[PDB]
Symmetry: C3
Subunit: 308 residues, 3 copies
């Protein structure tokens, strides 16, 4: 079914899923089959699920269907290089969580929705969007012919939905910083315990962050181009901010676009590098993600000093 | 249903309707209910109407669904601050006219359609697009389950359709100049008579112009950004003009984009300021529209002299 | 049905089909009727065919539905100015081939699909896309109510599908160079024989090239603007190339966009001028296509030396 190069390269952390949208669902199915065997998801339901999820992603520059699949791939690479650490249901739940983690994203951050006084901010006070992304996942599961978890027991159903809920909520980067701080203290004290469910939850949350930010772990040309999509959303949000009468944070002001390289150094130094560093400590086979991140940091440093 | 901020701010003339498309129909329904009570439009038909109208707007940069709703809002603010001046049917008709006034707009002016020898120019010699926008409104009303005026008598139906026809045709800016000149002489002579149906018609036409141009009555950041959308259409039309072998008017030539500030001073001085000035004379509670216009004129003057 | 200007201008080689998408199918039907009479295509099936073909074109900057119709028009002008040279079925087949020749084009060249290891490259080793475009044409013909060739005999059906297959495959510009070389030797030796089916096939292939490149035979403003769409695709492909780790050919590198004028001189000198020159030798009434091409070459030369 899938090409030769894709079957080889899909195992690489820095794999790009390519421009051909119609290939991505099969990419995702292949990944699902190759983690949880060909035997646990009914292929007609699964594809009906995938295609409905795709439909509920929006045509935004970055937080789109392609991002969903790119994020799911990263999890696949992590899961594939840490065999026997996670359960069958976890590998299912995490792959589906990643695919659905940005469902119905409109390009705006939680802060804007708050400032806009959006209805979703009234419903979900914290992790507004991420709570909506989970709510959307449920609703798609509850469509006729879409319940990909019908073969599971009721207990396993609740279990996997809880795995998915927590993993999607972890993609709220506001939660990353505390999580990663906790995990860092657990590692340095030697107290991190993967048999501890609370600890597992945090490690899963950090895995989710690592996957969500994985654009920074690709090769320079991919990383550089995706950066345009990211800022295209930030600047559109800064515009909407100015339309509300609020002077947006500099990152979101297209008039300050000359400062993108500096904003990137900021992001890598405060978020990306610490994230992959901590993940590599906990899961050493994720080293390539960190190496690629360090490499892209140097590229941004080359950009800054005029060597682009 | 609607957010707290929106319920407060929607009463302000300079209210922006925001980036969330799915909120606009409820914004429009709220406005309709709050002008004509919750009791005269059957909510299932009304929403079926609104969603069909939305479907027949095109994905053009400016004359799109968002513009339709923005224009309808302005009318709502005018109508809300001039209570008892207009009838129930007028407030209904004008709100619906505004929503439908640009139905099936493809980003091109009447002059281009003429020069293109477009079929619609053969059907409607004058006010080509505006006659088509009305024709489109009728056709959507005549869809099964879409006749939002079924509770009305036949007489009131004809009446309201005539209100709508005239108001949509008034959005042809070629007609503005004569209308506003007449209204200006009627005011200065003391002969303007709102009990005179012919006079009312003109005032309604000027209200329609004021609403249609209301982008110039928003706060600078909104006004400035919408200006890009306006010129994005003008330049696309100037391109099509050059493709016909006709050197377009400078406003429509993207090579002369450096002259946008001057074109804006031209527009405000000849069209916008006179329009809101005359409206404020006739309807004093519309003063804020004029103040905002004067403010934006100064911003364009700041742009011109390099203070942006 | 069609406007007055269009009925006049549609006979001109450099006719632009305009910005109004909804007019193009009638433009194509008019062209089909005016080549093969109003009597051989059943209008309800034909329009069902046209609208299905349109649906299977993608929203890419250049190789889109508009291009399809523009290419079909050029064939119409060639066919109209060389009466009695081609058969009824040929004129049908070639008009339909042109409409379908880029069906499901995603903006990428055969080389990229190859380098990507795309599945279509496995199915069709040579002329990958063009073989897929033909495969897509067949599939649309085989839809219920879409078989526009049902009035034909089985023999004439095979015949016309073979005409279409060869003409679509000829739009692979890799094949142009050999074809045109052969045709050039046949002309200079006096051995070209239009009663020779093999020779006819080549002339048809060159006609297809001439139609496909016809953007270079329009008036400067059309030619210049379409060039942006062409490079918008090339640069997107060069991006995807860099994402695969391959440094793309300079034409496809947006960083080398300053070299577009030179790339154009290259293209006209090596491909376009030779193509129309050879066509004018074989079909003298196609001279205007060559004149327009030479004119645009001078415009590109004016651009180069700073006279834009
Ligand atoms: C919401 C996007 C998070 C995210 N994902 C990636 C790949 C990025 C990148 C490369 N840069 C960012 C800079 C600031 C920021 O602030 C939120 N987020 C960034 N980001
Ligand atoms: C058709 C657009 C009318 C219109 N609405 C707005 C808000 C505008 C603005 C800000 N500027 C304009 C400048 C020229 C012009 O000429 C037609 N129309 C303009 N316009
Ligand atoms: C695939 C596009 C063929 C094509 N059609 C037109 C009208 C063009 C033009 C104006 N320039 C081209 C320059 C390079 C190139 O290389 C392929 N193809 C070009 N091209
Ligand atoms: Mg998110
Ligand atoms: Mg209009
Ligand atoms: Mg092609
Ligand atoms: Zn995400
Ligand atoms: Zn309007
Ligand atoms: Zn083509």
């Amino acid at each position: 079914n899938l090409p030769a190069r894709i079957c080889r390269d899909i195992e690489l952390f820095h794999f790009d899923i390519g421009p051909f949208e119609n290939m991505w669902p099969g990419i995702f199915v292949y990944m699902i089959h190759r983690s949880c065997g060909t035997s646990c998801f009914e292929l007609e339901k699964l594809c009906r699920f995938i295609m409905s999820v795709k439909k509920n992603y929006r045509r935004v520059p970055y937080h789109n269907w392609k991002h969903a699949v790119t994020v799911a791939h990263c999890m696949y690479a992590i899961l594939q290089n840490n065999n026997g650490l996670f359960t069958d249901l976890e590998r299912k739940g995490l792959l589906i969580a990643c695919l659905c983690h940005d469902l119905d994203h409109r390009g705006f951050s939680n802060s804007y929705l708050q400032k806009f006084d959006h209805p979703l901010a009234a419903l979900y006070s914290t992790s507004t969007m991420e709570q909506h992304h989970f709510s959307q996942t449920v609703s798609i599961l509850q469509l006729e012919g879409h319940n990909i978890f019908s073969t599971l027991s009721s207990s396993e159903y609740e279990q996997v939905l809880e795995i998915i809920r927590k993993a999607i909520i972890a993609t709220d980067l506001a939660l990353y910083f505390g999580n990663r701080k906790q995990l860092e203290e657990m590692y340095q004290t030697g107290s991190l315990n993967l048999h501890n469910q609370s600890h597992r939850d945090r490690v899963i949350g950090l895995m989710m962050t690592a996957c969500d930010l994985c654009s920074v772990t690709k090769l320079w040309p991919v990383t550089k181009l995706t950066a345009n999509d990211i800022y295209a959303e930030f600047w559109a949000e800064g515009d909407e901010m100015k339309k509300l009468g609020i002077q947006p944070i500099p990152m979101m002001d297209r008039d300050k676009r000359d400062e993108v390289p500096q904003g990137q150094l900021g992001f890598y130094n405060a978020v990306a590098i610490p994230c992959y560093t901590t993940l590599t400590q906990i899961l050493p086979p994720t080293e390539p993600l960190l190496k690629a991140c360090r490499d892209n940091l140097n590229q941004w440093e080359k950009v800054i000093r005029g060597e682009e």
